[PDB]
Amino acid sequence: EKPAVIEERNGEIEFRVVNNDGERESLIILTGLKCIFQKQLPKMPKDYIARLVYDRTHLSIAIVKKPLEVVGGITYRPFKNRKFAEIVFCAISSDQQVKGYGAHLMSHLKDYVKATTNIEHFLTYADNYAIGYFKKQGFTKEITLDKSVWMGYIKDYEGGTIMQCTMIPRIRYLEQGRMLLKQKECVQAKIRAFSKSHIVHPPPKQWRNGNVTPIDPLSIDAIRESGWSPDMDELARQPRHGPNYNQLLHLLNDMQNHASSWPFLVPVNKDEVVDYYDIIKEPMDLSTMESKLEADQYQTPEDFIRDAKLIFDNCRKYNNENTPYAKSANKLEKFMWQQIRQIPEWSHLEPS
């Protein structure tokens, strides 16, 4: 039980679902939520946040302290007929972020919507630093909804990254801990019901005389019953992804997080510009290289370096050097070279 749970049980904190009805308490709660959201999202105008929070269709779930102080909250607009609700904001005061309230609040929201209505899907536009939190809370970057269900209904937010989540029916998301722990306990007991590792076997009969010679594991009775084969032994040591998957994933996350990679986050549309495809015969963006890496097509790091260099070259080719596009592309090339130089292995691949 994380500190949020004990604090809630002891009455230190408390949650409240509030909409702009016109009471006294509701207005305090809504204004505090507006203050928090305005603090955390400085880029957007304060007018737009003020309009969205104080609307008459949206809801809000907030966490309040005993002397009526609000720490954070989430805002959403349910589409009851379309079986999906949109999340529009999310934030917690930075001073109190260390406690770890985010998952607890998300569980409260999911449970409430599940038990009060019949929605299934959540659609959101995540910020560029909340992606880890959203992923840890069950969302995914791949969308599995038809283009008719959620087109024209949600509102685009520039600089975002749409995500999805499909709630699993008939579960109590607040008690995940104990339920999953018991499920693990019972599967582990089932496993321990057979595992012969509790049997302390004598030295192999070939080595009982003091001579050590190779022994085929399939010869032994216990191992034989274990069904060990050379094939599985050799296969179990091959990771699903490429060996550098963790390091390239770290680099990809750093590059995406960097505020110098915005123009490449998504490709350029054919409708908006026609000459982009006609001039560039190898249009490459970040999503394309990520997918190709997921396909294992990139055999060597040189492929990734060439892809980045070609992306930069295309950016400079389609957009003039004087224009900010090419200058930003060169700055991002410098940033990637910095990241690589931080890696000794790839430091020697920089041309002179």
């Binding site: 699993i168 084969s229 296969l235 490709p267």
Partner: protein, 339 residues
């Protein structure tokens, strides 16, 4: 590394042994001294390990079905561990962690069936650990051969698989779909409302924490009442906007082309009369408005009479069908289809 797991490395060959059958030295002289099957096969000893007179233990990889004929113990444990770490609902990473080339859809279906949607409750399987038919229904060798075959086939397919198509630009909802730039018919909201500046007075408002009532008088403190009073005006503004939208929805004021075409086909005097009569539409409903206008036009056309126009239709050799019956009957009550 973001993963919270523990990596196990053999003490002799320094080869990962976590996901493989292994053997450990059980003598108290050796602590956490793990020897892989090859090392224990070739018998390469190090430190205080004695393969001659010390009893050993065989760590089994526990490969056989328990719940699902296509899934073994290791796969299920990895699934639940991923649920603990990667969060229950994150199917992509948990599928990646389980391995075996199970696409996210397959892992989701397997979990739903086995645990969530099942003839079962959070106590797994039929009755107890005493039910041991599935383990002795297939020999482990056959199951492992099936796993090897499926893995090799899947690897070959992936190597021969076609390249994944590049992601297109994300399908921006662009709620401007209506034929009025900046109209969001999916939300029934405009972008530039009646008093879009109304929020200019409450976008900086802040409340004193933990306040709301006077500790002494029991009444709202002057600042609190003043602050509350400035939001009642905002609520009234919102309600005015809502009434505006309700009125505009009716009467079909969103069909620019049709209404303009209809006015264009109309003559001068009829256009002027309809323009004059426009304002009262707020107080009637569509049918009443149509009756009112059509009555005015009928009166004007009859006065004039006393493609072809109405004045040219009334003076036709054959009278139209709707003019052979009194509009209001003898007992003073107008006919229902007055206009």
């Amino acid at each position: 590394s973001g993963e919270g797991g523990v990596k196990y490395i053999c003490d002799v060959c320094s080869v990962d042994i976590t996901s493989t059958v292994r053997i450990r030295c059980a003598d108290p002289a050796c602590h956490d001294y793990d020897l892989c099957v090859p090392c224990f096969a070739n018998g390469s000893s190090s430190n205080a390990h004695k393969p001659a007179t010390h009893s050993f233990r065989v760590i089994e990889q526990n490969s056989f079905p328990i719940f699902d004929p296509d899934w073994g113990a290791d796969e299920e444990l990895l699934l639940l561990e991923g649920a603990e770490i990667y969060g229950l609902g994150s199917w992509a990473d948990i599928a990646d962690h389980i391995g075996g080339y199970r696409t996210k859809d397959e892992v989701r279906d397997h979990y739903l069936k086995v645990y969530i949607e099942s003839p079962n409750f959070p106590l797994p399987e039929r009755c107890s650990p005493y039910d041991l038919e599935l383990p002795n229904s297939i020999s482990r060798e056959e199951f492992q051969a099936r796993k090897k075959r499926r893995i090799e086939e899947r690897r070959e397919a992936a190597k021969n698989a076609p390249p994944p198509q590049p992601k297109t630009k994300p399908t921006a909802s662009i709620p401007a779909c209506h034929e009025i730039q900046g109209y969001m018919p999916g939300r029934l909201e405009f972008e530039t409302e009646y008093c879009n500046e109304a929020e200019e007075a409450v976008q900086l408002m802040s409340f004193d924490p933990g306040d709301g009532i006077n500790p002494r008088t029991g009444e709202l403190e002057p600042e609190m009442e003043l602050k509350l009073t400035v939001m009642e005006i905002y609520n009234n503004r919102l309600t005015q906007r809502v009434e505006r939208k309700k009125v505009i929805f009716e009467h079909n004021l969103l069909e620019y082309r049709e209404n303009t075409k209809a006015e264009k086909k109309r003559s001068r005097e009829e256009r002027e009369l309809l323009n004059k009569a426009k304002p009262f539409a707020r107080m009637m409903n569509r049918h009443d408005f149509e009756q009112f206008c059509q009555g005015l036009i009928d009166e004007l056309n009859l006065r004039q009479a006393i493609p072809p126009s109405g004045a040219a239709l009334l003076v036709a050799p054959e009278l139209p069908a709707r003019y052979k019956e009194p509009i209001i009957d003898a007992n003073g009550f107008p006919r229902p289809d007055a206009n």
